[PDB]
Amino acid sequence: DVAGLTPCSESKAYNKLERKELKTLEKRLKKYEPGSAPYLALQATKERTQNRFKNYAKAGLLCGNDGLPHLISDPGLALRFNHAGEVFIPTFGFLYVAGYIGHVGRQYIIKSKEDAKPTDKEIILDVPLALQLAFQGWAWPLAAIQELRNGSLLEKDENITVSPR
């Protein structure tokens, strides 16, 4: 009941939206014979709509004055009101995947800059090396913070090209 938002299970406009979608799906369904492929496709669409409307309920979702679900944003408020999985956990998973991609790219750049003509390796990928680094990045945050600790993650400003003042 936070932010003046009713839960989707106890909401009123949520049910109106569900009935409206089921009504237009049934209106589209009534134009076809029961033993037809469009009938089966529309029945599958109606079943998916009902399952989505049921699964959006009984999960702590809140909607305000329109039946459209709202996402609780602040952690702590989301943690104490069963809304952590709305945005708190998805950004944790996204940060994991984004750090995976960044660490794999960093490892490929560092390992490809060692050999002669690194631009050829950049534009013609070493597929076994890329796949080896792809399956070795499952522990990207530990490795990243350890390179931060030993200083190999950062480059000294004396060795970095600097625009004139």
Partner 1 sequence: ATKLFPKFSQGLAQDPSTRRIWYGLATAHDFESHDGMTEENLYQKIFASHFGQLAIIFLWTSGNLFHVAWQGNFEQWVTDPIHVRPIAHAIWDPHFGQPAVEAFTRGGASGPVNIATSGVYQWWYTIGLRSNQELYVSSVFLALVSAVFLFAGWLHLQPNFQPSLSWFKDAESRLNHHLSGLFGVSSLAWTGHLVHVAIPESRGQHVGWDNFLSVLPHPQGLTPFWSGNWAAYAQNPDTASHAFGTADGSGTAILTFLGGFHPQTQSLWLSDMAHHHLAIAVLFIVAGHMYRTNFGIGHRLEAILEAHTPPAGGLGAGHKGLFHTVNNSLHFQLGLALASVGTITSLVAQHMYSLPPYAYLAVDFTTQASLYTHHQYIAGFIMCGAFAHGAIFFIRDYDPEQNKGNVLARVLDHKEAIISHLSWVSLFLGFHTLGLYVHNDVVQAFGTPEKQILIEPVFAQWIQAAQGKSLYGFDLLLASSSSSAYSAGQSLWLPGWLEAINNNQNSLFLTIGPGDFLVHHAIALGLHTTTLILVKGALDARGSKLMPDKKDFGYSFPCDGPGRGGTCDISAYDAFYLAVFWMLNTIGWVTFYWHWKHLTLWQGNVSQFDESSTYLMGWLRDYLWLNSSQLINGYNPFGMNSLSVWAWTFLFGHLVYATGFMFLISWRGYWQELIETLVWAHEKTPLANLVYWKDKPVALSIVQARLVGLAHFSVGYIFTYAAFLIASTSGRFG
| 85, interface contact from partner 1, ligand PTY, ligand CLA, none, CB < 5-8 Å by kind | ligand PTY
Tell which positions 47-66 bind ligand PTY, by CB under 6 A.
59-60
Q: Which residues of 2-17 are buried (b: 16+ CB within 10 A; e: fewer)?
A: eeebbbbeebeebeee
Distances in Å between the alpha carbon of 108 and those of 55, 104, 111, 140, 142?
A: 42, 6, 5, 13, 18
Cβ(83)–Cβ(73) under 8 Å?
no
Tell which positions 102-161 bind ligand CLA, by CB under 6 A.
102, 104-106, 108, 125, 130, 133
Q: Which residues bind partner 1 (CB under 8 A)?
A: 1-5, 14, 17, 21, 24, 49, 52-53, 56, 62, 64-74, 77, 87, 161-165
CB of 87 to partner 1, least distance (A): 7
Q: Which is nearer to ligand PTY, 12 or 80 (CB)?
A: 80
Cβ(72)–Cβ(83) under 8 Å?
yes
Q: Which is nearer to partner 1, 139 or 148 (CB)?
A: 148
Tell which positions 11-70 bind ligand CLA, by CB under 6 A.
none
Q: Does residue 76 interact with ligand CLA by CB under 6 A?
A: yes
Measured from the Cβ of residue 70, the count of other Cβ atoms closer than 10 Å reads 17
63 SS3 class: strand
CA–CA dist 151, 77 (Å, integer): 37
| 120, interface contact from ligand CLA, partner 1, ligand PTY, none, CB < 5-8 Å by kind | none
Long-range contacts at 18-23 (CB < 8 A, ≥ 24 apart): 18/49, 18/50, 18/53, 18/67, 21/49, 21/53, 22/46, 22/49, 22/50
CB of 16 to ligand CLA, least distance (A): 27
Q: Which residues lie near ligand CLA (CB under 6 A)?
A: 74-77, 80, 87, 90-91, 94-95, 98-99, 101-102, 104-106, 108, 125, 130, 133
